[PDB]
Design a protein around this ligand. Structure first.
Ligand code: NA
Length: 129
């Protein structure tokens, strides 16, 4: 599913991401824009042979099982395919564990490079939330 910006903002809010670990909703929407362009089916292979899955490009190296990432963990206890669903519950639940890991949203290199320090509120501008 390709979410609309405010559609994804509303879904993330419903799932308790708004100000989760002190990260306002605009940070999460900004991360999703540059990770996946709001596409739940987004997949990208990493140089280390791990894969990133879904709206927030959650990595098989640590967080989900894809069966093809040697030496990896599955700390969200989910198949990586669950992260591609039109239903973002599994992506949100797993994002909560990642952002709690100690480095906050720096875990998302695209958030650090493209969203951190910017006017992230612009990403929820006009949305009925
Ligand atoms: Na894994």
């Amino acid at each position: 599913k390709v979410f609309g910006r405010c559609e994804l903002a509303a879904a993330m809010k419903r799932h308790g991401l708004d100000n989760y670990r002190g990260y306002s909703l605009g940070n999460w929407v900004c991360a999703a824009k540059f990770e996946s362009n709001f596409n739940t089916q987004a997949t990208n292979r990493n140089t280390d042979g791990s894969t990133d899955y879904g709206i927030l490009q959650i990595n098989s190296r640590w967080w989900c099982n894809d069966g093809r990432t040697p030496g990896s963990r599955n700390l969200c206890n989910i198949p990586c395919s669950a992260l591609l669903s039109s239903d973002i519950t599994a992506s949100v639940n797993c994002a909560k564990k990642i952002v709690s890991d100690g480095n906050g949203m720096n875990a998302w290199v695209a958030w650090r490079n493209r969203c951190k320090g910017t006017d992230v509120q612009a990403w929820i501008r006009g949305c009925r939330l």
